[PDB]
Ligand binder design. Structure first.
Ligand SMILES: c1ccc2cc3ccccc3cc2c1
Ligand SMILES: c1ccc2cc3ccccc3cc2c1
Ligand SMILES: c1ccc2cc3ccccc3cc2c1
Ligand code: FES
Ligand code: FES
Ligand code: FES
Ligand SMILES: [Fe+3]
Ligand SMILES: [Fe+3]
Ligand SMILES: [Fe+3]
Lengths: 192, 446, 446, 446, 192, 192
């Protein structure tokens, strides 16, 4: 993409496009699809420990940002552009998982209901690290609780996955730039 | 409802009618007697440091533009065009010398002045009195050590006086530490609670921590973690509670400088705070140096709350009686190393941000308590805030304000709601003052 | 609106202002004069049979906990903590000796008593009068053959008296059958209708069945299927209609024991009901044994409806003037074989549950009729319920109540709305009684 | 609020309280004093040309059925069954001799008469007075060159008189062109704006075009494209503005026959309009033939707007103070070739339809201006409409009405809001007339 | 999964996970995807008779439950945990289809509009019945009617499909545990 | 399908079903999936010029209709059944793209956020034009702006794609019959 001509496109977004247009491997896309479907299934049934063990690498960065609304023409104001809703290493994810499983987590009774819809999967091996798989996918995440509370989350995920213990591919980075600035879902206490 | 006569808060603040969290007519009345009357948090110097820097902020349900002027002062204006009422600024932060309306192109200065009108000569000639068409300005804008508050009511007390006895507790962290910075941008989340539910909780509610936050305490690593599931009561002298004439109040948990931060930050923080406290002993004395590195859960009346040391900074922006837009910033000490500031900022959001696992513990509590205030059999029921009543003091030789010398109690609720009731039943600041001339006596009865 | 004077229901119940289905001020007024005053369905013995068993239920817009006590009685309490108003129980059913609040950990007994307060000694000392801090109790809780109703108003008539002439019709199925069980859990669905729309339809509306349910009648197999698309009018003497002083009423369709059930259940049901009727002839007489196995479409005023024999049991839980949360249970006879009970329960939900194909036929009818009550040109329009007026009787030798001796009419609407108007214009039960001292005369005029 | 005394619009229409776009009590009051009182657009002959053809339409928040009778006239009725209030017709258009209610099967004629009642003989006997049970009829239905308007108030002026001085401007396009057709079905989109925001914009707002529509002007090809980004002010004598006694008004942009249409249609249109104008010079004179092919942005009070030549036809259907359902049709000249009509219709929707890129430019302007009227500090603020005040005339020898002889001004706003205020403060048409007996003097002061 | 460690996971959910982790066949996943996409297409265009003929086995159980909200710690109260929104055999589904097609189904005029989004497809042959295919998938179902009525349904489907007449794979069991306890969609009168 | 028996099915819908049931090619479905995922990615990052260049054929018809609600039994009233929300040739799409990119498009500041979810992809070559690919797919389109504005669109797309410049398959027709009659999304200013 030429971002001087395509005026609305960020440098970051143009870089990510290039990665997938480049060298399509259908088998990789299918592997990525399996990986993500299985991850979503574990999360949906609230098998959080299994998710950590089977899907999350020890060196993970799990990050979801919220970007401040700024003028499209803005070029002077230069302070922190975003905050981290999540910016978790493995130990921090574990803390969150223990919080979910704690029997005195009162908000988890009656049990929550999650349903995830994963779409638009693309996969490409890193050019310079032959063992690093880039996977892009979008998620709709539906959380229902307490009779009439329903929250629906929408996001694009930029992941890096790499083979770990036992040759199992595990998530080593997830980056989400959350599209809604003001959350209308009570909180963002879901693993996107 | 007749707000002059209706007893919404009982004498000494001992109870409140549950309807206060649900009644939309009262909410509308609060817009006038709470939000249009009192000091409201806007921003920090650190977010608009240079000329032309601005942010938008809510003041009640109104939106304002808060702008750093060329002369270094800050002025705030309604985010509403003076022509046909369009919202002028659609972004949250930026730098500009002025703001142009997207409807008919009227251009306002950073100083609020109507500076240009398209084709003014051909259309209006000399008939448009631009001098009278400046943006509607927030009458009062003052700073507490870089923290900028606004007030629509020209008759309000100065911000410092408004903070009353609470200022003494905030000063060691806000002033004597070398100063704080606000780390933006904030998280923003809507909850289905009345603004008073989180406000009361932060002002005064240590009781809930062990039970509400049992899972976060247990999982999450932190210094206050002995409380998980009410396994342990803090020792006597673990803290105190205070409140003040104009409704601001806080809890003090002695020495809890690492606050809600997980054990990954505890050693570093406890080292940093202890080192600074050692220097401050010489400057402000041992008690106040200790307060600096003690955990304060405070509400600056009406709807700005914070946890010092934890670094949590909140605005409970009102939408309606059962809807509040929660803004969450991190506060850091300016002289901390930058890497620590970054990690502290992330940890604030981790615990109390949009995906804050501690904050999530509070959701059902705040939301159901608020929504229950709409339910027919509960409207006229009494919410209780009597814990520690008859043991509070005023005019103590060391700790100012109305003070309960215990870590856990409802002292700060009583002062919050005494101020609330005095405002809701008054038409102006003079009447509030008249209604408050025996404020501390009322709070220390029995 | 002045509810003392406003004629919302015309004399003899012949018409109602359409605004009654849309006006939110009237809805708020109903919370007081209908829902806080009258008997409301809570649960059945079969759902809380053992000590400590509880369920939650709505009573108007309030939520209550309904709990089986150690002594075998049932008590019901507001689902609201007596401290700061948090909802105590977040589940629909369970077994417990008490309920602990998730905010500050206050523990209430199954009997509503405040039994524990965390760290009470250290915090409150002896100053907290727990005896005065029990959950707010529903004043009245009575049973009609295992069906448990509550009433917030201590002055209400006993439930039996409140059922008035309707009780005689219900007793063969509710009592002489050996008793009924409620099969839970209920379906729960929100519809955009006023609670009165389904209430009036079930109390009294046989007229709609052939046309509204044409497709369900035709497709669905059932005994009443000759009516599809108004192809056939039931024969004379096919049924009757009744109503009562306190507003409860029903239609009677003679012999229709298989009700809305598809032909897969018709043979089995008609056999079972006929066999029981044969035994009941000897005990309660031929007419009442016939009533047992006749299809009753009934509303127990204000908002509980049922179809006996079909086994449909409804609660029209009010949310606002155009929102109702519909709860759907199945009723079965205790002595039916368990496999039949299971299939009957499934068939109730199949026809009238959340995906009930019959129930779906009624949606637009109820929703649009309700929403139209908000529309400017319709507010002051008159909803008509005059069919059969001047042919009703009272004090019949065989069939009690105000009775229309025809299967299809608007008798039960008139009695429902006469009771509604008498409540809405009255401040208490005494005034309702005064307004109702010539109830049956009013209904049988001309 | 006391609408008899409250000054919502200042003398000469120079300003309006911002609350008019947000206040729900005022919205409810408008239902009575604006929508139930005035002429509202229903449909066109071209959409219901044959006997039995009907459409549904909104009139305020009410829904009506508009039906072509056997005798060629049109009658309109409330879309509400006279029995228990169910919505009768669930479709937008069709052909039928009558409408049957899906609840109990009552059948109404295309003429509104209750024609059949299922099993009437067996159920009602001779007691149902069907003659009194016809659908509630819209009192007044009149045509302006095929454009059909309704009014619930029998006392209203005839439609022609109601159009006042605006009719003279519309007639060249609506009458002397040979007549217009409305191309359906309309687009339908809900916006979060008060109905007055788009109404005022279309009646009178040329000022916004260059700035609001900068991107659409620049991208989109059109004849008025020199205005993009306020790059150029139209020349003197480029147009005029007018307003009238009963609130209707418009802008006139001389010669702009291709309107907002992209350059793909400009040559063809400018040829077609010019050719017709040449023939019309002989019939109606040069000035009126020129008006025919000039772009008129008009609001027919209260909530019907159009852009002639562009072919945009709008209904701003009110839902609440910050919700409006926007209906968008295309108008074409009957004698245009069919292929041009098709392309013109598509171009209307392309620019101003649900995905209309021009229309999208206006969204934030209308929505935020409306929502700001709810905000506490803005309710009592003054929306300004003073541009060109003191330069308007009345009784001009060539151009009738209150007229500003300039393309860009606020003349039509002032007349719109003078009419609005006179209605809101009046109980009936007589009072409006009394309040309007010096209407043009008020508008031309100074 | 170890449900003693992963405290939020039900025995049923852990069993279903095992089935798909076991023996992945990519061709089966692709067949399942086709099957479900075609089924959704037939349903979306309201070809209900075609759906019965082409997609539904004569021995079908079509079941959607609603589970009562109970305490996560509950261990004493033992009454019926759920009710059946749907629990249909073939004849019962046919009744429902005839109800949809009946010209006096007034709620079907003007015609409804359905759009289904099927995601997260997994497929595995049964271990003990070589001809029984397990298929899991999630659905978002959008129903629009009457100008401004819009209802969106979200669910995970546990299906069994088996080859029938003409060798065509047909649905023999669908199980859905509906995630929202109190429906906010007017009704559940949609085939999930 | 027999539309005399399946009474709710339109002739048009029955024709489109036939096209995909006929001759399934798995490789084509996978190519179609790639095509659409890449198109959605370009649109999501607001690379509108790239979308035109890489995805849209010079002979395109891009059409989204809104159909008037009429009686299921209606057989006499015969006026225009639908209007065109979009009915764009390439030049008209270009106008819309320029409008999006114009720096005085005030509604595009702060920048919008789009996320698209593409599902239910089917692909079939045209019987009579060997180079014309029919592709069907459904889209959920989430647009977020201005802190708290969130609009979600739902649609089925009937596309024709054909190889163009450089052998790249490009969209030559998109037809969408929008399922909601009255839009509750402020506008339809999104490329479905
Ligand atoms: C109110 C709200 C949150 C609080 C959080 C705390 C965390 C650690 C120690 C004391 C606290 C007191 C609090 C009081
Ligand atoms: C009101 C609501 C539903 C009804 C359903 C019925 C089903 C079969 C026979 C008579 C019925 C009467 C009814 C009356
Ligand atoms: C109000 C609303 C839309 C308008 C659109 C216009 C387009 C071209 C030229 C003049 C216009 C005036 C307008 C006035
Ligand atoms: S509304 Fe701002 S310039 Fe007109
Ligand atoms: S609100 Fe229940 S213990 Fe405090
Ligand atoms: S409501 Fe129309 S026939 Fe009864
Ligand atoms: Fe808390
Ligand atoms: Fe019914
Ligand atoms: Fe415009």
């Amino acid at each position: 993409i030429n971002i001087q001509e395509d005026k609305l496109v960020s440098a970051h977004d143009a870089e990510e496009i290039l990665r997938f247009f480049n060298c399509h491997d259908s088998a990789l896309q299918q592997e990525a699809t399996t990986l993500l479907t299985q991850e979503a299934h574990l999360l949906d049934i609230q098998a959080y420990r299994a998710w950590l063990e089977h899907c999350v690498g020890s060196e993970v960065q799990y990050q979801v940002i919220s970007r401040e609304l700024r003028a499209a023409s803005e070029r002077r104001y230069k302070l922190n552009e975003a905050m981290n809703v999540y910016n978790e290493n493995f130990q921090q994810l574990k803390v969150r998982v223990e919080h979910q499983l704690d029997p005195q987590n009162w908000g988890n009774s009656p049990k929550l209901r999650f349903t995830r819809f994963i779409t638009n999967v693309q996969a490409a091996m890193d050019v310079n690290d032959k063992e690093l798989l880039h996977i892009r996918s979008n998620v709709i995440l539906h959380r229902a609780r307490r009779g009439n509370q329903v929250d629906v989350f929408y996001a694009a995920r930029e992941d890096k996955w790499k083979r770990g213990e036992g040759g199992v591919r595990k998530l080593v980075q997830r980056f989400v730039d959350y599209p809604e600035r003001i959350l209308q879902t009570h909180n963002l206490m879901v693993f996107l | 409802m007749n707000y002059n006569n209706k007893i919404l808060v009982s004498e000494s603040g001992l109870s409140q009618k549950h309807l206060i969290h649900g009644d939309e007519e009262l909410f509308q009345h609060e817009l006038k007697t709470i939000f249009a009357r009192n000091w409201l948090f806007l921003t920090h110097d650190s977010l608009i440091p240079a000329p032309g820097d601005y942010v938008t902020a809510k003041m009640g349900i109104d939106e304002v533009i808060v702008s750093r002027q060329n002369d270094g002062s800050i002025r705030a204006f309604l985010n509403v065009c003076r022509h046909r009422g369009k919202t002028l600024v659609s972004v949250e932060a930026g730098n500009a010398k002025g703001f142009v309306c997207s409807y008919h192109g009227w251009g306002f200065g950073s100083n609020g002045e109507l500076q240009s009108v398209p084709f003014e000569k051909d259309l209006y000639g000399e008939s448009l009195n631009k001098k009278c068409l400046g943006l509607k300005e927030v009458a009062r804008v003052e700073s507490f050590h870089g923290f900028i508050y606004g007030c629509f009511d020209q008759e309000a007390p100065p911000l410092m006086d408004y903070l009353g006895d609470a200022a003494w507790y905030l000063e060691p962290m806000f002033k004597h530490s070398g100063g704080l910075e606000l780390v933006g941008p904030p998280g923003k989340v809507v909850i289905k609670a009345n603004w008073k539910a989180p406000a009361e909780n932060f002002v005064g509610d240590a009781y809930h921590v062990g039970w509400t936050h049992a899972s976060s305490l247990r999982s999450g690593e932190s210094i206050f973690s002995s409380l998980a599931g009410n396994a342990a009561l803090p020792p006597e002298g673990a803290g105190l509670q205070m409140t003040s004439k104009y409704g601001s109040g806080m809890g003090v948990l002695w020495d809890g400088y690492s606050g809600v931060h997980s054990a990954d930050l505890v050693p570093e923080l406890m080292a940093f705070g202890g080192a600074k406290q050692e220097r401050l002993n010489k400057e402000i004395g041992d008690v106040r140096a200790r307060i600096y590195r003690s955990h304060l859960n405070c509400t600056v009346f009406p709807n700005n709350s914070m946890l010092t040391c934890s670094g949590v900074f909140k605005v409970w922006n009102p939408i309606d009686a059962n809807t509040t837009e929660v803004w969450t910033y991190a506060i850091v000490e300016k002289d901390m190393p930058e890497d620590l500031k970054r990690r502290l900022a992330d940890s604030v959001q981790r615990t109390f941000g949009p995906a804050g696992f501690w904050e999530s513990d509070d959701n059902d509590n705040m939301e159901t308590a608020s929504q229950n205030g709409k339910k027919y059999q509960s409207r006229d029921s009494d919410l209780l805030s009597n814990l520690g009543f008859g043991e509070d003091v005023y005019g103590d030789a060391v700790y100012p304000g109305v003070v309960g010398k215990s870590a856990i109690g409802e002292t700060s609720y009583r002062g919050f709601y005494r101020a609330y009731q005095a405002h809701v039943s008054s038409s102006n600041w003079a009447e509030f003052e008249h209604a408050s001339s025996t404020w501390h006596t009322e709070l220390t009865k029995t």
